Amino acid sequence: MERQLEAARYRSDGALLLGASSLSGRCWAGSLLFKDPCAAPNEGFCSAGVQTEAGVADLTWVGERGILVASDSGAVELWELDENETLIVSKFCKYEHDDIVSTVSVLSSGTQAVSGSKDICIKVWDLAQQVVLSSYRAHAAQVTCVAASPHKDSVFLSCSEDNRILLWDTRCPKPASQIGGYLPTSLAWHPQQSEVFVFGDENGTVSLVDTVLSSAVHSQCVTGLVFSPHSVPFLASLSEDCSLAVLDSSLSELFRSQAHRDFVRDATWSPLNHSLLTTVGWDHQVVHHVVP
Amino acid sequence: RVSSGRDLNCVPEIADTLGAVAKQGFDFLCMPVFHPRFKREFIQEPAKNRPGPQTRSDLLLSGRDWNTLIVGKLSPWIRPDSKVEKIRRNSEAAMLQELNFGAYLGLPAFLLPLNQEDNTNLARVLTNHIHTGHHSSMFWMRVPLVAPEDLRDDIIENAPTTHTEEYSGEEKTWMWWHNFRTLCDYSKRIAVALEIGADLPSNHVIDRWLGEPIKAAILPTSIFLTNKKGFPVLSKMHQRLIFRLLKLEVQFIITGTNHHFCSYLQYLEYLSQNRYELFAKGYEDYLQSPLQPLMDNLESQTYEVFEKDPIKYSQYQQAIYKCLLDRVPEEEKDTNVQVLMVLGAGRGPLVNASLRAAKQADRRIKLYAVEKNPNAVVTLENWQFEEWGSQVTVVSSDMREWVAPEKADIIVSELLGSFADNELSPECLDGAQHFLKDDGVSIPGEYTSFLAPISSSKLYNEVRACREKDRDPEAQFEMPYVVRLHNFHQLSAPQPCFTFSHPNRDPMIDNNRYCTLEFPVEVNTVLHGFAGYFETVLYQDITLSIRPETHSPGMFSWFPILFPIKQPITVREGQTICVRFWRCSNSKKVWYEWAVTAPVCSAIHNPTGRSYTIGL
Numbered sequence A: 001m002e003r004q005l006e007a008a009r010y011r012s013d014g015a016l017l018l019g020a021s022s023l024s025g026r027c028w029a030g031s032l033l034f035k036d037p038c039a040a041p042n043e044g045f046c047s048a049g050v051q052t053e054a055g056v057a058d059l060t061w062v063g064e065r066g067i068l069v070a071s072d073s074g075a076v077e078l079w080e081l082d083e084n085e086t087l088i089v090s091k092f093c094k095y096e097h098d099d100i101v102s103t104v105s106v107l108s109s110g111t112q113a114v115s116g117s118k119d120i121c122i123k124v125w126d127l128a129q130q131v132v133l134s135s136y137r138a139h140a141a142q143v144t145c146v147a148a149s150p151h152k153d154s155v156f157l158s159c160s161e162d163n164r165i166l167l168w169d170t171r172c173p174k175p176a177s178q179i180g181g182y183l184p185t186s187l188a189w190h191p192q193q194s195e196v197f198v199f200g201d202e203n204g205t206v207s208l209v210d211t212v213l214s215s216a217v218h219s220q221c222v223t224g225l226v227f228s229p230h231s232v233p234f235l236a237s238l239s240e241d242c243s244l245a246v247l248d249s250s251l252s253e254l255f256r257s258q259a260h261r262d263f264v265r266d267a268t269w270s271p272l273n274h275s276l277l278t279t280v281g282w283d284h285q286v287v288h289h290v291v292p
Numbered sequence B: 001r002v003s004s005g006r007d008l009n010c011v012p013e014i015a016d017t018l019g020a021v022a023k024q025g026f027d028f029l030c031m032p033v034f035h036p037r038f039k040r041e042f043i044q045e046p047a048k049n050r051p052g053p054q055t056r057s058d059l060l061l062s063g064r065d066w067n068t069l070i071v072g073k074l075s076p077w078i079r080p081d082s083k084v085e086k087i088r089r090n091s092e093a094a095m096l097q098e099l100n101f102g103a104y105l106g107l108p109a110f111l112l113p114l115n116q117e118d119n120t121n122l123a124r125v126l127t128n129h130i131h132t133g134h135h136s137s138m139f140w141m142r143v144p145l146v147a148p149e150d151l152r153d154d155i156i157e158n159a160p161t162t163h164t165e166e167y168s169g170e171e172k173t174w175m176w177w178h179n180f181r182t183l184c185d186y187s188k189r190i191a192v193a194l195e196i197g198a199d200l201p202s203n204h205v206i207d208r209w210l211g212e213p214i215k216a217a218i219l220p221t222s223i224f225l226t227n228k229k230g231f232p233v234l235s236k237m238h239q240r241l242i243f244r245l246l247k248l249e250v251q252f253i254i255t256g257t258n259h260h261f262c263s264y265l266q267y268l269e270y271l272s273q274n275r276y277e278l279f280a281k282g283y284e285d286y287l288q289s290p291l292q293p294l295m296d297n298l299e300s301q302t303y304e305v306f307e308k309d310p311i312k313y314s315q316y317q318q319a320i321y322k323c324l325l326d327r328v329p330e331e332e333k334d335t336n337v338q339v340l341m342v343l344g345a346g347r348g349p350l351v352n353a354s355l356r357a358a359k360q361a362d363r364r365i366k367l368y369a370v371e372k373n374p375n376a377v378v379t380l381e382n383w384q385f386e387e388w389g390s391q392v393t394v395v396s397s398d399m400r401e402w403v404a405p406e407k408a409d410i411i412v413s414e415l416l417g418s419f420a421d422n423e424l425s426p427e428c429l430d431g432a433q434h435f436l437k438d439d440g441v442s443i444p445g446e447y448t449s450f451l452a453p454i455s456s457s458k459l460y461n462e463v464r465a466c467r468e469k470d471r472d473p474e475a476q477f478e479m480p481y482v483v484r485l486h487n488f489h490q491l492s493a494p495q496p497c498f499t500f501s502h503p504n505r506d507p508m509i510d511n512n513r514y515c516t517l518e519f520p521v522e523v524n525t526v527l528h529g530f531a532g533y534f535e536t537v538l539y540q541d542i543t544l545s546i547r548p549e550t551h552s553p554g555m556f557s558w559f560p561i562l563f564p565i566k567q568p569i570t571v572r573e574g575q576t577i578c579v580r581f582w583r584c585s586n587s588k589k590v591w592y593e594w595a596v597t598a599p600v601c602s603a604i605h606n607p608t609g610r611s612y613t614i615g616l
Ligand SMILES: Nc1ncnc2c1ncn2[C@@H]1O[C@H](C[C@@H](N)CC[C@H](N)C(=O)O)[C@@H](O)[C@H]1O
Pocket: B293, B294, B298, B303, B306, B307, B343, B344, B345, B346, B347, B348, B349, B350, B370, B371, B372, B373, B376, B397, B398, B399, B400, B413, B414, B415, B416, B428
């Protein structure tokens, strides 16, 4: 398997999805399922795997057998599991962006998704027809992250290196709305509250925004933010300082993990055990954390 | 023949990608030398101790493939001008790392972005890299014609795009480049990779890039239209821009993914096939020292180039033809012999131009071929013994010192330079004026020099490089150059400068001149120098000219002349450029002095002829 692990996503039953890519050496490509999460990242004891043409910048589940991939090739790929879940086959590969597709997120309906890319463009996809519904050029720099609304099918967030955080609503004639520092880097909706979301910046600051509370959590760029599936959610923050932090309702630090020796790229909570949290990094480490 | 390259940000394997790009018809490939997403840490642990290798090996390509086929790209995560200090420190170390690796591979060019206003620290890290050894490395600054903020969709509800014209605002990306290259002090290793967008800006924005060192034009696939057949094409306005970029012989770069792969390439080759200049190609923006045929003796082949101009000599023959009829009517064609004196005959094309002029005019003439260059006299006297005969009298003397046996009806000369009088034609004809009859005709009878303010950061950098070892370090700015002006921008219509007439019947002959010219400038630009042309009246309506608006169609002789200035001068739209020119002379030398007095003042250039004199 490739060295640099990029994404880790648990599904319903507890299977772990891994997205990796080789960011050095001769060949620059990536790879894509572990029904035994403790067996990761060993390649010999996996359920399925496949090699794509280029690297994986971001991915996300599509239901229970679909994998939506953001590729370095500028294409959005959707991979699907067979009925036996032993093979990972490509469904379509649409080269619609002109640069690296850096972020992807599935809307609420599960039939539409949004992709951002370094071509400063944001596109809305229809996973059924394999076509691009709308193409928006609202930012003036690389689109860093897009995050669909958890419960509104036409609403999603986006941030770019133009220091803009845009709230979207494709039901309006002008769908983008700018939300009022340092460049934002990761976006995460609140799972239980509608008009509440969090974001981290390149300076290691996580902030709480309503439609403002902030705390200096990390010493480097905040790479991702994932809420816990509890009733009152925890906030897991991973950054380029190679540390993992778990925050509460008031953004206070409850847990801190420095197990990783390189950048921590993703984090996923276990659906079976709500206290277990799995993180991956560019050190090829899959660490399972027991959050108190 | 279009030199074209393919820009990519995704290269899974160099060997396979380079072959696929080459099989599509491209000549080179723009690729990153490190993985674009492989962000690296240089200061903080434990990420700074990341085990290698950091990128691909140099063994994956031959040395010649690195030298001629690969163009490196700065990683898009490197931001040396970040407001965060840690990101600056990492980006500085990373930028040097990728720059040094591109130099390690021996890459012909390297791409750096200009996508924001402040690139001061980006310019310093590049300036320190350039001043680390004298290596043949080129750097292409990727700057868009229209800023990304100025072409975004108007889809933000609470921040609508501007719908009113901002004249200088629409020129902001040129300001990004102008500031950047000024910080880098006009480095010859720094050029422009202009990026074309789907919607072109106003005409004055494209005109800003005239005279800029554009080595590449970047064409995204997303700007191409689609015909009925489904092939990519361009709008007529883009076609107009591609044709202008072809005159600069830029390298076109195709970026983005395939939306319709050699179709984009074949459309560029299609536009290239569908479009004086044959002789002037090769000398474009090549600085030359103006000839001084008086102080120096011209070589044989120098005369040979002068004579390969049939349009120039047919005008002289026609001028002599009309003057013979106007002086000898029909009833003395057998008894009236006109005394013609070719003052400066060279190898004798004007003597033959006089023979052909007397034949078609059916008049008798007596010729004197006066030449001071003794080597050219060898050509004249062999011409006179073999063909001309006793009709022509060769005189090996300076026309100012010659004691003529008789007086002439007509005197013919081609003592003009690119700036009319810069070869001292007035001084030579004045000294030759005493043996002209009281009703004598001088051909040419008058001539006038023209000047026009130009903008060309390219030519300014070329003059700047002409510094020599044992002379004033700024002497190269205080002397004119004969150059086929090419990549430049003429900011105002040329205006007449100095005028001389022959014969000068005035008793107080004085060839010293002082002229003040005010040029209306209707654009924002940067003044680097003044283009010089000339016009001359051989006889009545028979004229010669290198002034562009009235240029003699089909004449190869005389490229424009260039008067530079030491420091570039900023000129805003609506301002007037005022230049002052002096023609100075003593008993031994003639020279020009010039100064800018508006909108700001420059120094007086070449005072007392300290840097440039014309030998008398
Ligand atoms: N004071 C002078 N006396 C005699 N010859 C001169 C003088 N000044 C310049 N010349 C010559 O005039 C010529 C200048 C040439 N441009 C003309 C060449 C020739 N008339 C032609 O049409 O090709 C050179 O041969 C000079 O040597």
